[PDB]
Write an enzyme that holds these catalytic residues in place. Structure first.
Site, PDB file in Angstrom:
ATOM      1  N   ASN A  30      -5.831  -0.881   5.940  1.00 34.94           N
ATOM      2  CA  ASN A  30      -4.768  -0.195   5.211  1.00 34.94           C
ATOM      3  C   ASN A  30      -4.101   0.910   6.005  1.00 34.94           C
ATOM      4  OD1 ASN A  30      -4.107  -1.086   2.446  1.00 34.94           O
ATOM      5  ND2 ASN A  30      -6.319  -0.938   2.149  1.00 34.94           N
ATOM      6  N   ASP A  70      -0.896   1.636   1.829  1.00 30.74           N
ATOM      7  CA  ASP A  70      -1.590   0.948   0.751  1.00 30.74           C
ATOM      8  C   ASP A  70      -0.804  -0.335   0.500  1.00 30.74           C
ATOM      9  OD1 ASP A  70      -3.111   0.150  -1.395  1.00 30.74           O
ATOM     10  OD2 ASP A  70      -2.738   1.893  -2.639  1.00 30.74           O
TER      11      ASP A  70
END
Ligand SMILES: Cc1ccc(C(=O)Nc2ccc(CN3CCN(C)CC3)c(C(F)(F)F)c2)cc1C#Cc1cnc2cccnn12
Length: 268
Positions: free
Chosen positions: A135, A148
């Site tokens: 991420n 994200d």
């Protein structure tokens, strides 16, 4: 300057959509061009969840957080447009890297940048909820930014191995459960992208953590970084360090390391 003006809203026609990124490992995220200024960007497309994400991102501005440039949320298709990060995600970057370039001081640099964004989210009272190398995005000169991709993994689907005990057991998520995840991130950085808890199967993890098992220090991980890892895996969330403390620690380690690396660079 006019009645229906919105400073975040672009027109879909401003953007050239190209290929989907990463074989589709990021979901509906494409490379694109903001044709006005040229500029290669990334574009996520699709609904409330999408609108929430847009609304949150407008609230976030930090050097180590993937920067929002615009949205197209007046009508479908919905777009979110961010700066483009040219080396892709941190996990694969680590798996593929030349360790002569991605040296020990770089690993500390990566950790300092990530803790820095998280201290920012901590100050802002946000909670990431899915911190992991997969991420984080990498750019030029080992620039790292936290992102994200809403990637959910095995209530919902969980990234079991990055997940704090109180989150697995009681569904309590907090900046302290981010701190726990960040600790697994450190171990991912330290192993250059190894899967956590190697050889151990997912169904056993919690029980082992609750018996006070933690992952061993990776070969070559500095003692103090491991100290930090293990502070991050304190069972009581209240016992975990803050991202302010964490970032302060890594900066300091980072600065000490570069004196050495630069010096080593001169000699070579
Ligand atoms: C188009 C796009 C749209 C959105 C996002 C994105 O990360 N969104 C995001 C949403 C929320 C939050 C904070 N919340 C988390 C949840 N939490 C519950 C509340 C707080 C954050 C954060 F960074 F702050 F963490 C980020 C990334 C991209 C990308 C890209 C890109 C650029 N170069 C490349 C190269 C390869 C692949 N992708 N790529």
């Amino acid at each position: 300057g006019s009645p229906n003006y919105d400073k975040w809203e672009m027109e879909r026609t401003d953007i050239t959509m190209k290929h989907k990124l990463g074989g589709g490992q990021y979901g509906e995220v494409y490379e694109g061009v903001w044709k006005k200024y040229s500029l290669t960007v990334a574009v996520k497309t699709l609904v409330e969840e999408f609108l929430k994400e847009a609304a949150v991102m407008k609230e976030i501005k930090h050097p180590n957080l993937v920067q929002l440039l615009g949205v197209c949320t007046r009508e479908p298709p919905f777009y979110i447009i961010t700066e483009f990060m040219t080396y892709g995600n941190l996990l694969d970057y680590l798996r593929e890297c030349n360790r002569q370039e991605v040296s020990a001081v770089v690993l500390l640099y990566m950790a300092t940048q990530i803790s820095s964004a998280m201290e920012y989210l901590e100050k802002k009272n946000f909670i990431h909820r899915d911190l992991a190398a997969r991420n984080c995005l990498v750019g030029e000169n080992h620039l790292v930014k936290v992102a994200d991709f809403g990637l959910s993994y095995t209530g919902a689907k969980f990234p079991i191995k990055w997940t704090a005990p109180e989150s697995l057991a009681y569904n309590k998520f907090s900046i302290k459960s981010d701190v726990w995840a960040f600790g697994v991130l450190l171990w991912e950085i330290a192993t250059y992208g190894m899967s956590p808890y190697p050889g151990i199967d997912l169904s056993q993890v919690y029980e082992l953590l609750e018996k006070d098992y933690r992952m061993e220090r990776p070969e070559g991980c500095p003692e103090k970084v491991y100290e930090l890892m293990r502070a991050c895996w304190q069972w009581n969330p209240s016992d975990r360090p803050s991202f302010a403390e964490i970032h302060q620690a890594f900066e300091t380690m980072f600065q000490e390391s570069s004196i050495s690396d630069e010096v080593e660079k001169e000699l070579g």
